[PDB]
Amino acid sequence: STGSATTTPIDSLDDAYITPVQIGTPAQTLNLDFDTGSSDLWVFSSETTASEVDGQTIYTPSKSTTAKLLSGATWSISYGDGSSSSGDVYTDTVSVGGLTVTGQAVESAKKVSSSFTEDSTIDGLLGLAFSTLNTVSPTQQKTFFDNAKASLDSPVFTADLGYHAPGTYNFGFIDTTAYTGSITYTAVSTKQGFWEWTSTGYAVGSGTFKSTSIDGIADTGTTLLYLPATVVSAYWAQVSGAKSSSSVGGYVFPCSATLPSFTFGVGSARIVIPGDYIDFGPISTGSSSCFGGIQSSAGIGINIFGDVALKAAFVVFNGATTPTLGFASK
């Protein structure tokens, strides 16, 4: 089997991407944030504290003939951005782009943090990291991809995120029309539960490539590119007037600037992030100070190849017995 679904930016800045997901019978379609940095499929629901729901579409398990309470199971997650959610668990039929999993753990939120409430466009998350990170207790649950894997034509999914445009998540096949040149594959460590890999270096604009190992995670659920302070300083040093602002919470730059590209290495291959992808617009409405899309990972504890990086590539998440990651230009 295979699946193919379009993923759409939630706003004009590509702050996140939502993908429609069918849950239950009859189908209830929710727009979920596909997140290769976590491993829970959780949704706003009929059980979510009413004051914490603000415009989201909810899953109502009582209206699904295939929903079953997973007795005794609870979940609770905190994300790297400080947001969180928790609740109980149902199993139900879940389909993505034509690919159907029966008995998928659907984690129903009883509580969500304000960040989730305040974002009307995201109805929940669909985790695509390794199932070892799943938070369901006392019986850990498998991700959608893990459940689908054996049935897929090939045990892979691909992320093809657009810049200020829709893109595609495919399951079970590699669309050879969706990228240019060849796909370069690189080793993955699953030790921390993430799609963790090592970039071979970077360049700023038309500058020379610096060969240096940068361990980080491929994370579709993180907006920006978080890299070591040395790398980030080298980038912003090429933008007149750019500075790290403790009050804003990162590098800002004059909105009048033209940003240089940023290149990262995948083995001997190179992925070029155009300068425009690194512009996240005014820090507040009407400001002439703009927020940068490349930020320091210092104090995160890990480097994160988030959407800024991934949307410059066609990315293969290869879930074979020994997982790997593939990157192609597009």
Tell me, yes or no, whether 78 and 105 share the same domain: yes
Tell me, yes or no, whether 189 and 323 share the same domain: yes
Contacts 24+ apart (CB under 8 A), 168-171: 168/4, 168/5, 168/6, 168/7, 169/3, 169/4, 169/5, 169/7, 169/19, 169/34, 169/96, 169/97, 170/2, 170/3, 170/4, 170/97, 171/2, 171/3, 171/4, 171/96, 171/97, 171/99, 171/145
* Last residue of one domain, picked from the residues 119, 153, 174: 174
* Burial of 50 per CB tally in 10 Å (0-12, 13-18, 19+): exposed
Q: Are 61 and 70 in contact (CB under 8 A)?
A: no
Sign of CA dihedral 38, 42, 48, 53: positive
Using DSSP, state whether 284 is helix, strand or coil.
Answer: coil
Q: Which string of DSSP letters, residue by residue, matches 71-129?
A: EEEEEEEE-TTS-EEEEEEEEEEEEETTEEEEEEEEEEEEEE-HHHHT-TT--EEEE-S
Task: Give, in degrees to the nearest 5, the angle at Cα 217 between 224 and 155.
Answer: 120
Range(s) of the domain holding residue 114: 5-174
Tell me, yes or no, whether 169 and 192 share the same domain: no
Tell me, yes or no, whether 151 and 297 share the same domain: no
C-alpha to C-alpha distance for 289 and 71, rounded to whole angstroms: 51
Tell me, yes or no, whether 34 and 55 share the same domain: yes
- In one-letter notation, the amino acid at residue 268 is S
Reply yes or no on whether 199 is catalytic: yes
C-alpha to C-alpha distance for 12 and 17, rounded to whole angstroms: 11
CA-wise closest residue to 44 among 92, 94, 114, 110: 110
Q: Are 256 and 288 in contact (CB under 8 A)?
A: yes
Phi, psi of 151 (to 5 degrees): -85, -20
Tell me, yes or no, whether 101 and 230 share the same domain: no
Q: Tokens representing 69?
A: 């309470």
Which residues, 6+ apart, have CB-to-CB distance to 314 below 8 Å? 158, 159, 160, 178, 179, 183, 327, 328, 329, 330
* Last residue of one domain, picked from the residues 106, 139, 174: 174
Tell me, yes or no, whether 87 and 197 share the same domain: no
138: preceding bond cis by omega (within 30 degrees): yes
Q: Which residues are 167's β-sheet partners? A: 7
Tell me, yes or no, whether 38 and 82 share the same domain: yes
CATH number (domain holding residue 45)? 2.40.70.10
Q: Tokens representing 103?
A: 């008995």
Tell me, yes or no, whether 156 and 56 share the same domain: yes
CA-wise closest residue to 44 among 142, 159, 124, 158: 124
C-alpha to C-alpha distance for 58 and 29, rounded to whole angstroms: 9
Tell me, yes or no, whether 68 and 205 share the same domain: no
DSSP 329: -
Reply yes or no on whether 64 is catalytic: no
Rg over CA atoms, the chain: 20
CA-wise closest residue to 41 among 136, 148, 115: 136
Tell me, yes or no, whether 236 and 317 share the same domain: yes
Cα(first)–Cα(last) distance of the chain, in Å?
25
* Domain count for the chain: 2
CA-wise closest residue to 59 among 84, 91, 13: 91
What number of residues does the chain have? 330
Active-site pick, 64, 95, 199, 261: 199
Tell me, yes or no, whether 154 and 277 share the same domain: no
* Last residue of one domain, picked from the residues 125, 152, 174: 174
Active-site pick, 35, 40, 279, 307: 35
